[PDB]
Design a protein around this ligand. Structure first.
Ligand SMILES: NC(=O)c1ccc[n+]([C@@H]2O[C@H](COP(=O)([O-])OP(=O)(O)OC[C@H]3O[C@@H](n4cnc5c(N)ncnc54)[C@H](O)[C@@H]3O)[C@@H](O)[C@H]2O)c1
Ligand SMILES: NC(=O)c1ccc[n+]([C@@H]2O[C@H](COP(=O)([O-])OP(=O)(O)OC[C@H]3O[C@@H](n4cnc5c(N)ncnc54)[C@H](O)[C@@H]3O)[C@@H](O)[C@H]2O)c1
Ligand SMILES: Nc1ncnc2[nH]cnc12
Ligand SMILES: Nc1ncnc2[nH]cnc12
Ligand SMILES: [Br-]
Ligand SMILES: [Br-]
Ligand code: NA
Ligand code: NA
Lengths: 468, 469
């Protein structure tokens, strides 16, 4: 029997299994990775602590890791992103998983801590992260365990106080040197998303990064696929399920025109909205204008737009003064990694009327209302099902290759305590594994053609500086 | 005083050229703002710039920006069909030496290139501004042979190659001993516009044969992600319509390559109503095309199917004689990469050509099926229409102007070695900012805490050097 898990309802396991099987067909990169590396067992002996949205897509990633020999414990990286049938299927598979759609913030962080209590005794020796939270727990406890505890008493956020309480409690409950023990045993971390990678470079630059990191976000086959087309498909998906609103003929405002903001603006435009964009980057703003988006300030958009999407990875994008100016029943959501892009806490003395899970109506003093999705959390994961499997297969094949490099291909210490990206050969290899399913017929260079443009026939085909 | 130091189709076109230059000025705020900012400061006073770059109206605005900054100038076009004759006439009528005719011969093309280096008043140039690297390459071949390596000069390859070798020997015969070493020593740098030219530069740098510092303007974000992409999106179909007047809605089009030019070319045709198929050798680029809903096929798959074919690779031997034998009657074939060997045009000389109009030819095969060829396989957007529109050229040419300033005025301490550089992101962002007012953008300003929160200064730069946009 198996009891080392927390999920919503284990009876959803058969439903999750059915959808996982369907996803496998949609994820040739992961399936082909199992076929190539399965016999090789490169992950035998790995103890991977995973912190990433516990979805059906993630379930295929987890079982790819296992098929390569990895021992695993897993949590979601957001309180609303778990798909409970995915989590149930992983638990029924005998993998410790702690993930519930709609868990509390305190549950979220205690579940993260369970990553590090390994079954059979000990600690993990790998981390797979999305947003850096698990990585941040190891570094925060380590910093405190070494005596610099001052920051632990100086919070300024609901989440951050809960997080600091976790770190104190772990220091009080766990053996000496538990964080030093963890930090010693972690061979590396692979990080999924822009915000988490930002956290890594803050540690790298300060000289506090405790183990090698691979930046999976900046694989071309991640950042130019997941962030772009993934959001192009899943943003309006989340809006439709939450609101069932007609998109044709409405005006939408997207804050940000990086990879996520580009995909977000395209999602709304393709659905029929007239899309305006904000930006602070003059290059990205010129991109938005040349694509036919009107580029305006949030002050300018607030009285006018029917729908608002923050996509910046920054904070305080949609403020309480913006929401006071919005038309009655304007829709507001967030597709960046963290909820502080919208001033959700400034709304809490207002009347909230819940409509359905992850959909609330908020009334202002002058009677106008707004429709908030997922309380400002990631709308594509909170209100729909995240990115579809196929594009997630590209991201998670990168993730698996990153795990293999850090765990198995660091005998010569080629990875120091810095942040790395996968080589272009592996980036191109990820793309190759997805060509058959979509029906691409790749042209083969002749040798004189390859010489002509200065590449080998087998690649890589571009300079490391190429932007695609 | 009278001015005679030029070669143009017809100098009576100058008033016409001047009118369209004036209109282009309004569409190129980046160059006009650069004039306002740098004119008074005269950063290129003393510069003698040899320019090899499509002699279009857009280029004329660049020329007069360089002049307004203090530069002394001589200019030629970098393709036999890309010149706009009214633009060349306006530059000549302004007293600027220029040698460019739309439809010039290959022999004329290289003879005019050599004329850039005989400077009015005596002497040589001290700067080069290049598009494709022909002018740079004439210097390095001449220098290389002036040193002693005479071998390569007696090996053809194509028709152009033979002519090009013939020029350097004539220049070795007629000019004083040491002429090329003396050019090479006075050239303070070169700025290069295009992907093929930059590939030529890096190949020289890796071989240790690059003679002077070089700035890769192509790989500024405000160039490659705008000019190459949106420019071709607007001027490819423009070239096809003017050449053929064909209905694009309903047709199947094939684009070879899905780099920046291929991306913009496929978009040009899709937006015009075509169903677009694409070829690629790069699996990442091919995956991008398929995620945009383009069918990714081989040129052999497309030959009997597509109504229109566009090569956009910067490679060679993309559309072969075997492909063209397979094409349906009166398929349209053209090329938007920098050089004309993407299509095996030489192989087509064997068949019966009927000229339709300038830069449009019908070619008949033994079984009587025919194809329509645009610009004899040269750059279709510049041969058959007017190249990229002014506004997107303003970004590219502001980059060129800043690159000329860097190499001519900001290299007193040799901070630029004999290597290939790109412009800093601060200048890349600068270029974009100069175009925001014209296109109506209202930029948001970060507050101090928001700038700290994402790790940037309020005034930028906003992205890591690794950022792909
Ligand atoms: N929901 C998802 O499934 C998903 C997927 C990938 C990434 N993300 C997250 O989305 C966020 C954005 O990621 P990204 O890859 O697009 O990063 P990015 O750096 O590529 O783009 C962010 C853009 O926001 C702009 N910006 C910053 N502050 C702004 C402001 N005050 N006003 C207007 N624009 C501003 C920046 O100039 C930048 O161009 C991150 O938090 C990332 O982790 C979410
Ligand atoms: N006409 C214009 O106005 C204009 C403007 C800019 C650049 N150019 C020229 O266009 C050419 C392409 O430039 P780019 O910036 O797109 O370079 P790029 O490297 O970004 O794109 C070229 C693509 O061609 C692909 N390719 C190479 N050989 C191939 C083959 N045999 N079959 C299919 N695909 C193949 C490469 O994989 C690559 O993705 C260059 O010569 C450049 O100088 C023309
Ligand atoms: N479906 C998904 N699964 C996991 N992480 C995701 N991030 C975005 N979409 C996702
Ligand atoms: N109109 C134009 N002028 C100069 N160079 C160009 N390259 C592409 N289009 C051009
Ligand atoms: Br109010
Ligand atoms: Br035939
Ligand atoms: Na999904
Ligand atoms: Na033009």
């Amino acid at each position: 029997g198996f009891t080392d898990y927390i999920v919503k309802d284990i009876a959803l396991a058969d439903f999750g299994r059915k959808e996982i099987s369907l996803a496998e067909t949609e994820m040739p990169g992961l399936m082909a990775t199992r076929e190539e590396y399965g016999p090789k067992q490169p992950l035998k002996g790995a103890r991977i602590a995973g912190s990433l949205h516990m979805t059906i897509q993630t379930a295929v990633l987890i079982e790819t890791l296992a098929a390569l020999g990895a021992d695993i414990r897993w949590v979601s990286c957001n309180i609303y992103s778990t798909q409970d049938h995915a989590a149930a299927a992983i638990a029924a598979a005998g993998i410790p998983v702690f993930a519930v759609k709609g868990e509390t913030l305190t549950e979220y962080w205690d579940y993260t801590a369970k990553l590090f209590d390994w079954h059979g005794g000990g600690t993990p020796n790998m981390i797979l992260d999305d947003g850096g939270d698990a990585t941040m727990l190891v570094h925060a406890g380590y910093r405190a365990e070494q005596g610099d505890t001052a920051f632990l008493d100086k919070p300024g956020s609901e989440e951050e106080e809960i997080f600091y309480a976790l770190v104190k409690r772990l220091l009080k409950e766990k053996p000496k040197g538990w964080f030093a023990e963890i930090a010693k045993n972690i061979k590396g971390v692979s990080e999924e998303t822009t915000t988490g990678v930002h956290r890594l470079y803050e540690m790298a630059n300060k000289g506090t990064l405790l183990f090698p990191a691979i930046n999976v976000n900046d694989s071309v086959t991640k950042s130019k696929f997941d962030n772009l087309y993934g959001c192009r498909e899943s943003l309006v998906d989340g809006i439709r399920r939450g609101t069932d609103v007609m998109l044709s003929g409405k005006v939408a405002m997207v804050a940000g025109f990086g990879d996520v903001g580009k995909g977000s603006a395209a999602s709304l435009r393709q659905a029929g909205c007239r899309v305006m964009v904000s930006e602070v980057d003059p290059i990205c703003a010129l991109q938005a204008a040349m694509e036919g988006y009107e580029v305006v300030t949030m002050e300018d958009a607030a009285p006018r737009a029917d729908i608002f999407v923050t996509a910046t990875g920054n904070k305080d994008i949609i403020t309480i003064e913006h929401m006071r100016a919005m038309k009655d029943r304007a829709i507001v959501c967030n597709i960046g990694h963290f909820d502080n892009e919208i001033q959700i806490a400034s709304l809490r003395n207002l009347k909230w009327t819940n409509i359905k899970p992850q959909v609330d109506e908020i009334e202002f003093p002058d009677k106008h209302r707004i429709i908030m999705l997922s309380e400002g959390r990631l709308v594509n994961l909170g209100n729909a099902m995240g990115h579809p499997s196929f594009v997630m297969s590209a991201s998670f094949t990168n993730q698996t290759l990153a795990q293999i490099e850090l765990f198995a291909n660091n005998k010569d210490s080629k990875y120091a305590k810095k942040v790395y990206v996968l080589p272009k050969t592996l980036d191109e290899k990820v793309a190759r594994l997805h060509l058959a399913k979509i029906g691409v017929k790749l042209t083969e260079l002749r040798k004189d053609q390859a010489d002509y443009i200065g590449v080998k026939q087998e690649g890589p085909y571009k300079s490391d500086h190429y932007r695609y």
